[PDB]
């Protein structure tokens, strides 16, 4: 997304680095109340 | 019924009349009446007042014994590192491989003192939540409430559910509450006055 | 969708509704173990039962004490009986003292 001011602006404003950290973030926003494990949090989006 | 049950009409429909009467937030009221969080129904004051001094003496003694076992850990890791010095000071190897075992031992010491900081913070949190105890105060972490119960079984009573809500309604003075509310609407302003 | 015709499981009688000559009745008085009293109208040619099930869902005895109330059985399915039917007293005793030795040798030598 080299042409997109919106996309590079949101990459500047993402306040999140690390694929595992972002994966834990979307796991916490998606599944409330479950203790997060690495393999289940990784395969949640893929299985969904 | 073998256990009391709240009416759904006076708890759920906005505005929640039980929440307005007891001055509890709806998310902190659903957690009480649907068995997810404890609630301090009552607390002692003067027994709490003199046992503050006696129990802080006992707390300092217990934390001092914790520190005694902690310096036992300090001295044991020091003797272990000196044993590693004796068994690695005459073995011809690389300059860092003979010292990476000592760095691993120091990392083990660093996590020992991190665990000591963790348990001291746990004990500090327990003492803080005893010293700031009051009615209509929720306690999540059943383990923490359990620890407060078995260490401080006197000085307060806590419960969970519609029985606790009934106890709070019983320990409630409508005339004094109304005098406080009319004092606020006569004096203050803004969000507090609207509330 | 249909013309369905259904009846509840009872029949309606229709005689006259008179209130001048009725069968004679006499009122008993039962008191529960709550300290609450209830009155029930029985018939004249009717034996008064000793215990009546009142409106509280609890058994209320009569208020004029006349009956040798019985000595009925304990409900015999307790954990002690379910233990005794597969064990022995000496086995329970040696297990009791073996468990006692743990607290004795924990508190003292």
């Amino acid at each position: 997304f080299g042409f997109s001011e919106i996309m590079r602006s949101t990459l500047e404003k993402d306040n999140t680095v690390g694929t595992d950290e972002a994966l834990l973030d979307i796991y916490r926003k998606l599944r409330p109340g479950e203790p997060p494990t690495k393999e289940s949090a990784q395969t949640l989006l893929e299985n969904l | 019924l073998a256990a009391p049950v709240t009416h759904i009409w006076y708890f759920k429909g906005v505005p929640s009349r039980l929440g307005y009467l007891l001055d509890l937030a709806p998310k902190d009221l659903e957690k009480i009446i649907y068995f997810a969080a404890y609630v301090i129904t009552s607390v002692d004051e003067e027994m709490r007042h003199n046992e503050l001094s006696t129990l802080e003496a006992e707390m300092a003694v217990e934390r001092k014994a914790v520190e005694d076992q902690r310096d036992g850990e300090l001295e044991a890791r020091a003797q272990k590192l000196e044993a590693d010095l004796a068994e690695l000071e005459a073995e011809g190897a690389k300059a860092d491989a003979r010292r990476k075992v000592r760095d691993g031992g120091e990392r083990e010491m660093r996590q020992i003192r991190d665990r000591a900081q963790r348990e001291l913070d746990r004990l500090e949190d327990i003492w803080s939540t005893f010293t700031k105890l009051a009615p209509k105060q929720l306690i999540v972490d059943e383990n923490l409430y359990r620890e407060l119960v078995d260490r401080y079984g006197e000085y307060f009573t806590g419960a969970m559910g519609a029985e606790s809500i009934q106890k709070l309604i019983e320990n409630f003075d409508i005339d004094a509450e109304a005098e406080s509310l009319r004092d606020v609407i006569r004096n203050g302003k803004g969000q507090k006055k609207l509330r | 969708d249909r013309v369905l015709r259904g009846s509840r499981l009872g029949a309606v009688s229709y005689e006259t509704d008179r209130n001048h000559d009725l069968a004679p009745r006499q009122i008993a008085r039962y008191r529960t173990d709550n300290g609450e009293e209830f009155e029930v109208p029985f018939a004249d040619d009717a034996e008064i039962p000793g215990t009546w099930l009142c409106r509280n869902g609890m058994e209320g005895t009569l208020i004029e004490g006349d009956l040798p109330e019985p000595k009925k059985v304990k409900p015999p399915r307790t954990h002690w009986d379910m233990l005794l039917e597969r064990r022995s007293i000496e086995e329970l005793e040696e297990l009791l003292k073996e468990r006692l030795e743990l607290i004795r040798s924990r508190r003292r030598g």
Binding site: E21, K38 | D141 | -
Partner: protein, 147 residues
Amino acid sequence: EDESEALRQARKDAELTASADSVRAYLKQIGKVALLNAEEEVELAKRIEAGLYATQLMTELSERGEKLPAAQRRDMMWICRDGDRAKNHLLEANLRLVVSLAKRYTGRGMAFLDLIQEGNLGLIRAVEKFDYTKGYKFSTYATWWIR
């Protein structure tokens, strides 16, 4: 920094959540207690039998006889308390067995949690009826009473 640090932070944040479904709340509540093995079940059963005989003996003695050995009476009440502690620990261990058996009857007639609580009653009866001298795994005996 993802070696259980952020995982621990998200674990505590998930532990302090609401989880507004009752089935999910009960499963999260029963997931805390760890499982057991044969020797642990044997020693829990021995403590149960010792505590039951202790309270039976103390009731049948104090019904007609009064004695005051202080240490002996204190350890007798200690046995009576810790037997019930052992029994509660055994039940809280086998709650997952109850749920795993009751999950295959759903959809016909009753709810899910009614089935689970009926299995709880069956598990209490199996703990009452359990015997360790024959020497078997506890789940094989308790499955009959639960079903």
